[PDB]
Each structure stands twice: as structure tokens, then as C-alpha cells.
């Protein structure tokens, strides 16, 4: 299967400088152009540039002339885009993307995107709270206070609670975020049965599973 | 630095029974004393914190006591599976630091040891070495005696002798006795021979092999 | 650069009905324009090539028309699962340049929220901080104000609030607030209130507990 | 689930540095205090120093001072202990530990522990030979000896774990720069030799796994 | 593998038959001599008799001759042992059971015995109750009214096998009840669920009970 | 072996068992030495006998030790007429007995 498999998040501190990669996996890597876009948050989508991997040749947007330079590695199939002299307005999520028209349908593949974070503050990994009721139904929650930077993925049951999931977007206070999630359940499902929130924050390498236990 | 002196490096008990080890504070630590178990070959595992509140997990059988300089691990209806090194530890001044650690043993009936011989592995005979094997297991007590005869003649160069810990089961003691020579002297003699000395027996044990 | 416009920033439907949006380019672009959706957290995803022509797995649903100046993609039969930002996109000259993106709204019928309260957690006051939560769930219109009681007096600070987007299911919204306070100022109280006010009645929505 | 993951040897030349590495995963990484015990082979446990990978904050033992030095990277949620200009007296197992009081119990959790071991000395991989029985009762005793090797430790297991009962892993004795021990595991003799019996040897500070059958 | 198949329980009228029946698998079935032994619940051990599935060749005891019956089905690899007018004497557990000596070791092997109930009370499957409350938690689970013997009683579907105390049943107007206890650390319960698993066969009843706060 | 004084555990009746008129509220004597031992049960202070079932296990085949389970059952509106219900065990390791025992309320 066509994949193009993107970091998570890259914490840079300002002034320093930044490489993005791009690995591409299931088909001729040297075969289509790989594009750049970067998107800041709350904002729209803007083009970097795109590369054909094949001789490295290379169209740029002129705003993003000396501060990305894009690059490829053909022994390992990977794409990079190099970010320098850092600055707030550099932090952005940056997707790679690559078009595919094989004579009978056109297909698009992109990147998760990379959320890369231009500050001069540390990581902190999240502290995941359970939230347990002091009807038919039943809402639990789980609250992921205070990590940086962004982003963490909350899912329930490793994914297999789906239905009736609110996630709320993350909030920054105090230089550090957090959110919460909520999960509405048939009462006979809770707590007869195991409901797990797990979190992932991949800028600390931290995956936290933690049931919703009574009380 | 704090001085936590467990007054005996070992204690003894029957399984069943109960066991009580203490610890002796320099100075008054308050309740900030905490004990260990460690079992052979394993990383320590926390028992007690505040003097006698046990860490989840522990039974009840381990209780704690004391308040001040004077403190006490007690272990009830012990088990084989209790043999391990225990220590006490004072956190309440900085440095944090530790007891000497009290071996826990367990006291049974004498157990004659069961004794097998092994000639040299057909693989080693290819490196030029030649290993004899001999294991005497689940003898009790601990106190035993191999003699290598080769060809009845006593051979004690190149004798290679490990104790095992009490076993975490029937509670007794097992050695492996090793007599390592070259692949031309192995085969300069016929008669090989592991003969164990224990207080279960007047006569010893013999278990032999003939090179052929 | 060519520069798309996209003069609406927000477009209103209900479910089953249908919406447009316009794309204005400064410059002919001929019919090299795309289109692109996005939904909240995730990657584009590319609806429409070559003005009209859809990539695979986009539904009829979506058309794209227009050609020279005046682009437009028209959603039909639209539902809930359609709630993203979509972007216009030209790519006749270089730079390649977008639009600023226009997001779905779908209206429906006024629903009150369901409110759940949640007191700080053991593992919590162990940290020296104390949360209580207060998740107030598939509600609509978004607007809605929620305020914090202690002991009977309000407290307006050390909150976060944070709404979800439009649901993906019902076309609702919904809404977490926390209130973040010391262990120490915690024990020091007992009770405990969430109040919620929105449209759909003038009586507000209260939950509590006890300590 | 906590865990804390430390690599199982290292082997360093004499007055030369290491770094022991203890990876944390499944809690907060930030949010509890890392503690670092010693201990020399056959000796007691010592305290090293204890550091909290929120802010760095460290209590050492006086005595350690200048011999270790404790880091952590938030970023992959490691802990480092730096040792340096290392001597005979700095071969030990070093331990990282943690303890999580989440409002109703209270958990300890500990690293395997890194056995150090500082000597001039290189690598040797163990020789694992079979102890079968001598040719021609209702059980039968079989052997494994794990011969020549350096540094420790070694991993012995039988049928890679299944065969747990009967089993004695002797104590390593050191001759000549060189370690060795022995393994028995006694079955029935329905089991034996009708069925195999695997001596299952692990050697990392060689990348050494070696999977022995004890064949009649 | 050689294992001997009972069925685990058999509920007949007083003065009927029961058809004990003994699946052989693993070896040839005409090669050995087929035991049968009779046990009363909490009495020791008697031979009924023995067969042989070659030629159905039997030795029978005085005391169960007019009682018992030996046959086999070839075709099938199983052993039969009929007992007929049966009486509140004949409740009891009966075993199938061969020796094999196969030139270097002797091997016992043994079926887990089917015990026979002589009752005009009617099978009634049991309910199983949670039993929901420092460093352990002892939980329990009770099973309760249950007809006839036996029940199986697992924790997390044997996964959970240490500090499990499960205690024999009590007889009270033709029902059993019996219950079986736990004790598991402090941060495996609440935190894991811990589940009761109780098998019925004689009711065709598997029941699995999740201890929940 | 060594005498050894019994782990008490009280459970009273879950809810479950209440919706079909039964209550059972059961007892654990866990890992006691010798057998010999006696459990009494108090309704409201009052030592009750009838409905009271007894089992005990065979001799732990780990720690040699014994264990019982004590089992009152009665009617739910037995049950809900009173609210103090107590489990008593005297063994020969101490004079005074343990006492677990949990109310209604
Ligand atoms: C900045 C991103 C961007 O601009 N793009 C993009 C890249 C990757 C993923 C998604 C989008 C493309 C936009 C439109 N395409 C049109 C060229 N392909 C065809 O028209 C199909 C040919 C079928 C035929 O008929 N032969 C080029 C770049
Ligand atoms: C050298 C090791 C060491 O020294 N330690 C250790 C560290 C990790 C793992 C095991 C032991 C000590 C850490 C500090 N203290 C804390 C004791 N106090 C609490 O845990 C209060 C919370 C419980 C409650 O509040 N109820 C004892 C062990
Ligand atoms: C009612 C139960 C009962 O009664 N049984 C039983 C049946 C099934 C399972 C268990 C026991 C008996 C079956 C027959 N066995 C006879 C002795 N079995 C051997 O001796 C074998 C060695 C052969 C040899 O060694 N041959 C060579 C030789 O010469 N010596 C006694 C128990």
C-alpha cells in the first residue's frame, strides 16, 4: 500500500534549525513530485514547493526561498525538508504529499503532517486524570492536563469505542495545554466492562493508559 | 550518615512459623524507615514504607513495627518462597541509607542429595577441552564434599564447584561440581568418578563412567 | 501572485440539501483549479482536479464547474460526515497558490445540553491540584455560558472552556469546562456548581456535588 | 503498564565513562522522582542519588559526588546515570527505581538492573554443551553447561521458559578472566526422550542466543 | 496424545439405567485392558471390573455383577458400564481408566470420572452472585442452587489460579451451594477486571460473572 | 505447621441476588491453622443460628493452612428487618475474636 509516513512533532528552539522527513513506502519512489505544504494553526493552507525525486529537481514558492530546502534520499525512498533560522511564524503542521495518476484513476496520498513547534520552553509530557461519575446511559471523561507541545491522540479502548466520543481541541494556559475527552456508554457497558482512555504524546515518547474506574 | 544496623546476617525459621528481623537506628529516624526483600538474582522489591504500612501487592504476612531508633520486620507463616535477603532502610535524614541485610534460611530434615554424572559432550571434544560434570541437587543441610577420581586416583586441579541458594520450593541446597581437562588427558584415562560426602551417609554417594 | 478569493467564509445547509462555493482568481487560470477538503485534524484531501474531474473516491456528490475566472463546488445531498473547510486551489501558474477556505455550517433544530459534572480525582490531589469538570454535550446552537459556583459565590477564573467543532453525527455542538483549583483552596469548600445557560430554555441547566 | 527498562551489561575499560540508561513508559514521566541504587556483586544496596525529571531536580549521595552524575532527556522520558573515571570498585548492578502513590495504593517499580563490569578485558561469547545422560528410572536428570564467557550475566532458561519446575541454575564461578555455570532440569522419563528438551542461552553483551537440545 | 473422555455428570431417576461411556483416543483402543472404579463421595476406592476391547473378554466383581455391564464400540473407540435399578447407593463417581507399559516406562491414564446422581429431583442450573467489598482485596463469588454435582469454578478462565480458595458445596433441599474466594493485590482489583467463571454441564450453563465495585 | 490466625472477609448480599427474594451474606475464614474453630454471627448484636451453612476446605496444598467460608441466608424481607450484620471467629491464636462485620444503612 502506498504510504508516506511523517514524525508526529519536532520542538525547535528559535534561531536553530529543523529537518522534516517524508518516507515513502509502496511504490517507485523516483516516479511522481513530491509537494510541501505548510499550514499554521487556526489558518489556511500555503505551498513550500514540490521536488521530483528522480534528478532533485525542485520548484519553490519564493516565500519560502531560503528558509526551506527540500531534499531526497534515494537508497532510503525519503523526502526531507529542511526549516532554518526559526521563528514563531514557523511554527505550522507541514504535510507532504505526492499525486498519482496511473493511467486509469488519480489518487492523492499525503503525510500525517508534522507539527512543528518554533519555542524555547521544554517538553512536558501529559497527566492523565480519570473522570468517573460521583439512567440509561452513563458519560465518562478523561482529562490530559498540562503537556507541550503539541499534539496528543486520545482514543478509547485502543479504538474500539468510537460512539458518542467528544474529544475537545486543546486549550494553552500558562504555556502549557491540555484537553479533554468524554465517552457516553450504555450503563450495562460501565462499569461492568473495561473502558480505557489512552493517550499519546509523541514529543515525549509517553503512552498512558488509564482506566475509568469507580471511584 | 545515618548508621541502620541489622544486628544478624541471617535468620532462621521453619516454614509456617515466623521469622522477625530488626534494625537499629543511629539516630531517631522518626517512622521514615522502609524494608526491602530481594530474592537471587532479582531486583529489590519494596515491602514496607512508614515503618509498617505495606506496598500493594505485599501480604500481610509482612508486617512492620517500631517507632524512633528501634524497628522490626516480621514475616508470619513463611514460606519457601520468603528466602531472600532483607533489608531496612532510614530515609528520614539525607543520605538515604540502608541496613547490612539479614538472609532469611529455613530449617529442615536432612535430605541426601541426588547425584548425577555427565561425561564430556561429543561438541566439546572438538575444542580440545573435556568437561565432567557431576550434579548432587536437593540435599539438605548445605555442608557437602566432592572428590574427583580419575581412574581412582584423586584429581583436584581443575575442579570448578557453585552452591545454589536454598531452593524456593522444598527449601534445600544443590552443587554442581565440574572437572575440566584436555581432550588428550580425557582420553589418556578410562574411570571417571564423582563421589559426594554428606552427613546422610557413612559410605558416599559414587556415580562413575568408563571413557570405553 | 494569482490570488484565489473564496469571498464566503462560511456556507449554511441542512442535512440532505445542497451547497456552492465560488472561487474568484485574479488572473486566467484556465481550468487548472482543485479543490480540497479538510476536516478538523486531519490532512487535505483532494476533491476535485482540473476544475470538474473528482479523484478517486470523492462521490458525485461533489462538483466542481467553471472555467477562466469563476470557479465553484457544489455539495449535494449533504450530510453530516461533509462538515470541513474546503479550499479552492490554482495551479496554471507558479506560485501555486490557495484560497483562504471556506468551512460547512449545517443547520438544524435547537437542542438543550446534556451536563455532566466530575470531581477532582484521587490520582489528581496527589499532583497539589484539584479539577472539576463539567462536560456539557450535543447541544445548539454553539452559543452558550457556563458559570462556576463555590459555596455560592462565582468564580470566574481558572477555567478553561473549549468547543468542539460541529458534530460529525448530529450537526451539534459540545462544550468542556474546567475549573482548576489548589488541593488546599479545594478542601476549603464544599459545594460545587456547574450552571449552564443556553437558548433552548431560561431556566438554567445546573449540576453540583458535595465534597 | 509502568515500566522502566534498563540494558542488561555493560563493559567498560578502566578509566573510561558510561552511561546507564533507564527508559520509562506507560506514566507521567515528569510527575514522580527517579531513584538510583548500587549494588556491588555479593555486597548490599547504596543509594546513589535520586533526581526529579520535571525540573532536574537532584539529591545525591555525598559519596557519589563526583562519580555520578544524573540527567534526564523528557523528550524520549530516559534517564541517564553518568559514571566516570571508573574503577574495580564501580563493577555493580545498578538499579533505577520509582515509586507511585496514585491516592489509594502505593506501587514500587524497578529497573532489571545494568551490570556493570570495569575491566580491560574484551567480550567472549559463551560455548553451550549438552549434558545428555550416560547410556541406559522414572525421571531422568538433564544438564546444560554454559562454559567460558565474559562478561556477566547469562540468561539459562529450558524449552524458552515452559519448563520451570525442576530446574537449578547454578551461580557463575570466575576462572581466568573467564565465567562459567551449569544448568540442570530434571523430567520425567516420558518426557524424556521422547520429547526435547531445549537449553535456551542469552549472552547481550555479545548479541549471543544460543538454543541447545539435549539429544540422547 | 492418550486421554480418556467421560462425560462429567449423569442425573437419573431412581430404579433407571445410566450408561456410563469411556471415548478412547490417542492409542489403539484394542490393546489394553479397560478398568472401571467406583468412588462415593468421600469413601474410598472399589473395582467394578474390566474389559477388554478386543474381544470384550470381562472380569467382573461378585459385588457388581448383577449391577454392572461392560461393552465397547470398536468402531467408535469407547467403553461403556451400565448400571441398572439404580439406588441413592450407586450415587457415587465412576472412573475409566488403562495402563500402558510400552517397553520403557509404565503410563497410568485416567478419565475425570462422571459423577452419577440417582435423584428424582430435576436439573436446575446455578445463579452466580459477585461478591464485591489495605495492600490485598479478597473477592468471592457464590454459586448457589445448583443440581447435581459438579460445577466448575475458574478465575479469569484459570489465568487466576493463586490465592483462589474454593470451598466444597453444602446439600440443602436438593440444591447445592458453594462459593469460592480470592485474594489479589490492591492495584490488580479495582484497577483489572477480575471475572468468576462457572461451568455447569449437567445444565449445559457457562456463566461468566465480572466482580464489579 | 505453626498456628496461624484466619484472614476474615464479610460480603453482604449483592444486588443481583436481591431481585430474586434471597439474600446471602457470606463470610471468608481464610488460611488458618489448626481446623478447630468457631464463627458466630450477629444480627442487630443478636447471635443468629438457623440459616447458617458451613464449609470448610481440605488442607491448603501451599501453606498447609485451612480456610472456611460461613454462609447466613435468609429472606430479603429477613434482611432488610435489620442492619447491623456481624461475622465473629474464635481461634485458639488470640482470646478476643476477630470481628468484621458491616451495616446496612
Ligand atoms: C500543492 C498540491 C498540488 O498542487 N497538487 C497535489 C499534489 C499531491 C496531492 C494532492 C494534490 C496537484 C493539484 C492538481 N494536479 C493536477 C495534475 N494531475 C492531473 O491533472 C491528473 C492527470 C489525469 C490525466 O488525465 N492524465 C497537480 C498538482
Ligand atoms: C533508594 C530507594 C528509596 O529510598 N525509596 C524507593 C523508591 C522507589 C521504589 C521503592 C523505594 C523510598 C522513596 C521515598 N519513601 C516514600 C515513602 N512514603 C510514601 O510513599 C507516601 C505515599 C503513601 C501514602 O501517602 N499513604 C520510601 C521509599
Ligand atoms: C483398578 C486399577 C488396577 O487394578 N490397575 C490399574 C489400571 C489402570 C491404571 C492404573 C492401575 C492395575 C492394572 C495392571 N497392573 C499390573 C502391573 N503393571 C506392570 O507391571 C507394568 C510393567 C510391565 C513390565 O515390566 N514387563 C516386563 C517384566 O518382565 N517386568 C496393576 C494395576
Known amino acids: 500500500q502506498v504510504q508516506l509516513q511523517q514524525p508526529g512533532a519536532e520542538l525547535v528552539k528559535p534561531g536553530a534549525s529543523v529537518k522534516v522527513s517524508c518516507k515513502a513506502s509502496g511504490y517507485t519512489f523516483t516516479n511522481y513530485w513530491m509537494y510541501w505544504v505548510k499550514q499554521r494553526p487556526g489558518q489556511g493552507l500555503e505551498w513550500?514547493?514540490?521536488?521530483?525525486?528522480?534528478?532533485?529537481?525542485?520548484?519553490?514558492?519564493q516565500k519560502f526561498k531560503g528558509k526551506a530546502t527540500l531534499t531526497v534520499d534515494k537508497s532510503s525512498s525519503t523526502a526531507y525538508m529542511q526549516l532554518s533560522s526559526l521563528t514563531s511564524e514557523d511554527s505550522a503542521v507541514?504535510?507532504?504529499?505526492?499525486?498519482?495518476?496511473?493511467?486509469?484513476?488519480?489518487?492523492?496520498?499525503?503525510?500525517?503532517g508534522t507539527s512543528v513547534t518554533v519555542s524555547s520552553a521544554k517538553t512536558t509530557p501529559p497527566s492523565v486524570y480519570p473522570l468517573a461519575p460521583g439512567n440509561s446511559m452513563v458519560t465518562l471523561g478523561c482529562l490530559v492536563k498540562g503537556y507541550f507541545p503539541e499534539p496528543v491522540t486520545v482514543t478509547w479502548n485502543s479504538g474500539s469505542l468510537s460512539s458518542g466520543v467528544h474529544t475537545f481541541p486543546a486549550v494553552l494556559q500558562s504555556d502549557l495545554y491540555t484537553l479533554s475527552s468524554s465517552v457516553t456508554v450504555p450503563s450495562s457497558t460501565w462499569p461492568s466492562q473495561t473502558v480505557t482512555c489512552n493517550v499519546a504524546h509523541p514529543a515525549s515518547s509517553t503512552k498512558v493508559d488509564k482506566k475509568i474506574v469507580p471511584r | 550518615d545515618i548508621v541502620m544496623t541489622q544486628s544478624q546476617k541471617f535468620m532462621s525459621t521453619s516454614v509456617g512459623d515466623r521469622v522477625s528481623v530488626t534494625c537499629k537506628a543511629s539516630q531517631n529516624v522518626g517512622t521514615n524507615v522502609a524494608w526491602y526483600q530481594q530474592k537471587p538474582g532479582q531486583s529489590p522489591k519494596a515491602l514496607i514504607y512508614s515503618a509498617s504500612y505495606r506496598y500493594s501487592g505485599v501480604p500481610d504476612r509482612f508486617t512492620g513495627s517500631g517507632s524512633g531508633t528501634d524497628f522490626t520486620l516480621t514475616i508470619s507463616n513463611v514460606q519457601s518462597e520468603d528466602l531472600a535477603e532483607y533489608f531496612c532502610?532510614?530515609?528520614?535524614?539525607?543520605?538515604?541509607?540502608f541496613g547490612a541485610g539479614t538472609k532469611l534460611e529455613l530449617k529442615r530434615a536432612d535430605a541426601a542429595p541426588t547425584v548425577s554424572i555427565f561425561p564430556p559432550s561429543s561438541e566439546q571434544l572438538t575444542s580440545g577441552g573435556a568437561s565432567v560434570v557431576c550434579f548432587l541437587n536437593n540435599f539438605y543441610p548445605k555442608d557437602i564434599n566432592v572428590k574427583w577420581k580419575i581412574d581412582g586416583s584423586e584429581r583436584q586441579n581443575g575442579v570448578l564447584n557453585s552452591w545454589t541458594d536454598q531452593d524456593s520450593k522444598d527449601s534445600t541446597y544443590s552443587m554442581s561440581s565440574t572437572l575440566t581437562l584436555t581432550k588428550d588427558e580425557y582420553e589418556r584415562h578410562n574411570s571417571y568418578t564423582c563421589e559426594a560426602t554428606h552427613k546422610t551417609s557413612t559410605s558416599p554417594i559414587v556415580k562413575s563412567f568408563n571413557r570405553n | 501572485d494569482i490570488v484565489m478569493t473564496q469571498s464566503q467564509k462560511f456556507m449554511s445547509t441542512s442535512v440532505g440539501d445542497r451547497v456552492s462555493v465560488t472561487c474568484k482568481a485574479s488572473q486566467n487560470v484556465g481550468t487548472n483549479v482543485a479543490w480540497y477538503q479538510q476536516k478538523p485534524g486531519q490532512s487535505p484531501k483532494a476533491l476535485i482536479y482540473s476544475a470538474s474531474y473528482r479523484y478517486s473516491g470523492v462521490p458525485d456528490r461533489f462538483t466542481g464547474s467553471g472555467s477562466g475566472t469563476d470557479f465553484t463546488l457544489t455539495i449535494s445531498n449533504v450530510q453530516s460526515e461533509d462538515l470541513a473547510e474546503?479550499?479552492?486551489?490554482?495551479?496554471?501558474?507558479?506560485?501555486?497558490?490557495?484560497?483562504?477556505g471556506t468551512k460547512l455550517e449545517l443547520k438544524r433544530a435547537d437542542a438543550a445540553p446534556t451536563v455532566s459534572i466530575f470531581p477532582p480525582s484521587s490520582e489528581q490531589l496527589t499532583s497539589g491540584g484539584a479539577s472539576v469538570v463539567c462536560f456539557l454535550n450535543n447541544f445548539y446552537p454553539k452559543d452558550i455560558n457556563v458559570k462556576w459556583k463555590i459555596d455560592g459565590s462565582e468564580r470566574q477564573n481558572g477555567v478553561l472552556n473549549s468547543w468542539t467543532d460541529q458534530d460529525s453525527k448530529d450537526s451539534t455542538y459540545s462544550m468542556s469546562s474546567t475549573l482548576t483549583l489548589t488541593k488546599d483552596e479545594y478542601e476549603r469548600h464544599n459545594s460545587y456548581t456547574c450552571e449552564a445557560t443556553h437558548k433552548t430554555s431560561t431556566s438554567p441547566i445546573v449540576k453540583s456535588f458535595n465534597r | 503498564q509502568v515500566q522502566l527498562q534498563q540494558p542488561g551489561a555493560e563493559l567498560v575499560k578502566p578509566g573510561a565513562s558510561v552511561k546507564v540508561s533507564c527508559k520509562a513508559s506507560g506514566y507521567t514521566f515528569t510527575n514522580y522522582w527517579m531513584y538510583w541504587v548500587k549494588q556491588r556483586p555479593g555486597q548490599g544496596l547504596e543509594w546513589i542519588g535520586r533526581?526529579?525529571?520535571?525540573?532536574?531536580?537532584?539529591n545525591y549521595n555525598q559519596k557519589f559526588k563526583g562519580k555520578a552524575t544524573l540527567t534526564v532527556d523528557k523528550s524520549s522520558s530516559t534517564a541517564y546515570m553518568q559514571l566516570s573515571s571508573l574503577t574495580s570498585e564501580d563493577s555493580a548492578v545498578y538499579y533505577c527505581?520509582?515509586?507511585?502513590?496514585?491516592?489509594?495504593?502505593?506501587?514500587?517499580?524497578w529497573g532489571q538492573g545494568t551490570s556493570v563490569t570495569v575491566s580491560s578485558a574484551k567480550t567472549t561469547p559463551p560455548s553451550v554443551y549438552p549434558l545428555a545422560p550416560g547410556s541406559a528410572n522414572s525421571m531422568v536428570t538433564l544438564g546444560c553447561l554454559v562454559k567460558g564467557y565474559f562478561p556477566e550475566p547469562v540468561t539459562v532458561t529450558w524449552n524458552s521458559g515452559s519448563l520451570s519446575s525442576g530446574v537449578h541454575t547454578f551461580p557463575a564461578v570466575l576462572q581466568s578472566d573467564l565465567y562459567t555455570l551449569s544448568s540442570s532440569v530434571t523430567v520425567p522419563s516420558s518426557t524424556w526422550p521422547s520429547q526435547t528438551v531445549t537449553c535456551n542461552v542469552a549472552h547481550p553483551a555479545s548479541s549471543t542466543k544460543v538454543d541447545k537440545k539435549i539429544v540422547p | 496424545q492418550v486421554q480418556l473422555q467421560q462425560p462429567g455428570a449423569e442425573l437419573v431417576k431412581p430404579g433407571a439405567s445410566v450408561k456410563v461411556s469411556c471415548k478412547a483416543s490417542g492409542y489403539t483402543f484394542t490393546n489394553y485392558w479397560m478398568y472401571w472404579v467406583k468412588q462415593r463421595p468421600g469413601q474410598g476406592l472399589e473395582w467394578?471390573?474390566?474389559?477388554?476391547?478386543?474381544?470384550?473378554?470381562?472380569?467382573?466383581?461378585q459385588k457388581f455383577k448383577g449391577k454392572a455391564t461392560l461393552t465397547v464400540d470398536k468402531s467408535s473407540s469407547t467403553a461403556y458400564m451400565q448400571l441398572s435399578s439404580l439406588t441413592s447407593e450407586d450415587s457415587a463417581v465412576?472412573?475409566?481408566?488403562?495402563?500402558?507399559?510400552?517397553?520403557?516406562?509404565?503410563?497410568?491414564?485416567?478419565?475425570?470420572g462422571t459423577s452419577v446422581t440417582v435423584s428424582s429431583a430435576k436439573t436446575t442450573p446455578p445463579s452466580v452472585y459477585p461478591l464485591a467489598p489495605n495492600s490485598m482485596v479478597t473477592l468471592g463469588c457464590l454459586v448457589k442452587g445448583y443440581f447435581p454435582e459438579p460445577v466448575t469454578v475458574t478465575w479469569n478462565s484459570g489465568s487466576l489460579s493463586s490465592g483462589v480458595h474454593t470451598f466444597p458445596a453444602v446439600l440443602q433441599s436438593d440444591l447445592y451451594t458453594l462459593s469460592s474466594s480470592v485474594t489479589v493485590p490492591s492495584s490488580t482489583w479495582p484497577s483489572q477486571t477480575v471475572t468468576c467463571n462457572v461451568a455447569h454441564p449437567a445444565s449445559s450453563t457457562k456463566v461468566d460473572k465480572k466482580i464489579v465495585p | 505447621?505453626?498456628?496461624?490466625?484466619?484472614?476474615?472477609?464479610?460480603?453482604?448480599?449483592?444486588?443481583?441476588?436481591?431481585?430474586?427474594?434471597?439474600?446471602?451474606?457470606?463470610?471468608?475464614?481464610?488460611?488458618?491453622?489448626?481446623?478447630?474453630?468457631?464463627?458466630?454471627?450477629?444480627?442487630?448484636?443478636?447471635?443468629?443460628?438457623?440459616?447458617?451453612?458451613?464449609?470448610?476446605?481440605?488442607?491448603?496444598?501451599?501453606?498447609?493452612?485451612?480456610?472456611?467460608?460461613?454462609?447466613?441466608?435468609?429472606?430479603?424481607?429477613?434482611?432488610?428487618?435489620?442492619?447491623?450484620?456481624?461475622?465473629?471467629?474464635?481461634?485458639?491464636?488470640?482470646?478476643?475474636?476477630?470481628?468484621?462485620?458491616?451495616?446496612?444503612?
Open positions: 532502610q532510614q530515609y528520614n535524614n539525607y543520605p538515604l541509607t
Open positions: 533526581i526529579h525529571p520535571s525540573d532536574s531536580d537532584t
Open positions: 527505581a520509582i515509586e507511585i502513590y496514585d491516592g489509594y495504593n502505593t506501587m514500587d517499580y
